[PDB]
Amino acid sequence: KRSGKPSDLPDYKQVYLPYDTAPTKTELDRERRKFMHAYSGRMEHRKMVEVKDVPQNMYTYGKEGMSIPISIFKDQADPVIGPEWTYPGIFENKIVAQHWYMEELFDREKSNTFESPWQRQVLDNQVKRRLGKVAWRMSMLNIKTIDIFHKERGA
C-alpha cells in the first residue's frame, strides 16, 4: 500500500564515534566483504543469499554512537544508540530471535537442550499460532464448505 510509507527519508547522522582507533581503510572492505551475504531459511533449506544496498563501514554502522532517523516528535532528534549491553536482552535475543522451523525446535525440546531459556517461549507462541490457524480454519467451516486449492491458481 502507498499510504503508511515514509516520504522523507532522513539520513544516518553519526553523532559520536564508537572508537578512538580509526578503522583503517584496508580492513573496512575486508570485513564488509563478509557481510554482503546473509543466510536465509533455517534448516537443511539453508540458503546463503545476497543482500542489496550494503552499507560501507560497519565498525561505525550501528554498534554505538550513530543516530537512527525515526525522528518523530518536535524535540526528539534522531536518537543516539547506546552501547550493546545498555539495551536489555540483546545478546539474549541473538539466541532467540530468528526464523525458527519447528522441525529445528522440537528436537531441542524433546532433548531439553535449549540454547536459550526463551526458546521455550518462542516455541509456544509459534504453536499457539498454528493452532489458531486451525481454530479459525474450522470456526469458518461451521458457516459453509471451504475447500483448499479447489479454485484456479495462477494465470
Q: Which of residues 13-52 bind another protein (CB under 8 A)?
A: 16-21, 23, 31, 34-35, 37-41, 43, 45, 49-52
Footprint of another protein on 98-127 (CB under 8 A) = 98-99, 101, 117, 120, 122
Residues 26, 38, 66: CA angle, nearest 5 degrees: 60
How far, rounded to the nearest angstrom, does the alpha carbon of residue 117 sit from its chain's CA centroid? 19
In this structure, what C-alpha cell is assigned to residue 32? 564488509
Distance CA 63, CA 130 (A): 36
How many residues of this chain interact with another protein, rule: CB under 8 A?
A: 94
Q: Is 10 helix (H, G, I), strand (E, B) or coil?
A: coil
Q: Which of 29, 97, 106, 115 binds another protein (CB under 8 A)?
A: 97
72-91: contacts with another protein (CB under 8 A): 72-76, 79-91
**Min separation Cβ 111 and another protein, Å:** 13
